[PDB]
């Protein structure tokens, strides 16, 4: 397990996925006054982002997940009393305490027997949420699980920082998991390297402020905002993720060309292109929606499913690989069959 823990589940399936994005659409024009048009043009070419959605002050990740959840439950026809666990994966919770999972439990009318867990993960979070939820179902702790995976990273961006300002958008998602009777297996790999903490971090805002003054890379940066060392993240990613993809493919037992899609965290288009090439993946089978939504952090994979795979999922079972990487450092994969599904949708606030 030198390159991550290998995990297998059976007896659980994805039953539906809904994404909810802010109705506020922010075009690149927005940024030309503060940043030079030429510089904006060159950066957005590389990152691939034409538009993104930004939450207003009264809209949180929890709110986006609640609205997605309402739509998902209505579509599935699942009664609130039937939900056994809700896991909220986010870096932008409502409160320091209580956890936002409790707010969602109450707002969705879930029962007292519904487990409520907030877990702090970023870009690597979706495959981990899938694994945890499917493990709960396999082990008989649950029959129906909701995964509320969302973020409003726009609220942590320094508006004077060009790289982060142009990159991030906001989204919230809800994924339904249910007990399944087939013999189909899901495979996951989950890895961590906390030595990367200082390369993707919000220095101030928690209970042990990072020593930003002592870090030359942070000169002129706001400590309450997101810091990213792009060069370090690129090198981390280009090394760890192709190995993750290879090993995931090997343990899932299916030929590369029999996958319907390889769903990557939408880090930036330059990175996505480099990863697909290094992993020898066919570019047409690597969906991208960063152009319309920006990088939506932990929401990026489920948002990709709803915006890019809705029509294909209606009709067939898809063989999917999912690869998340980022903050922690952390990286994670899922490889499994999904669908057909009728409840796959993208709504706005
Ligand atoms: Cl451009």
Residue numbers in the entry: 6 to 35, 39 to 284, 286 to 358
From the publication, what sentences describe this entry?
Here we report a functional and structural genomics effort that applied saturation-level transposon mutagenesis and next generation sequencing (Tn-seq) to identify essential genes in B. thailandensis, followed by high-throughput structure determination. We used an “ortholog rescue” approach to maximize structural coverage of these gene families, which are likely to be essential not only in B. thailandensis, but also in related, but more virulent, Burkholderia species, such as B. pseudomallei. Using only seven Burkholderia species to select orthologs of essential genes, we solved structures for 49/406 essential gene families, and for 56 total Burkholderia protein targets (including seven ortholog replicates). Of these 56 targets, 25 satisfied criteria for being a potential antimicrobial drug target.
By using an ortholog rescue strategy for insoluble or difficult to crystallize targets, we increased our structural coverage of B. thailandensis essential genes from 31/406 (7.6%) to 49/406 (12.1%). Ortholog structures may also be useful in designing broad-spectrum antibiotics with cross-species activity, and by representing a variety of functionally conservative point mutations in the active site may be useful in developing drugs less susceptible to mutations that cause drug resistance.
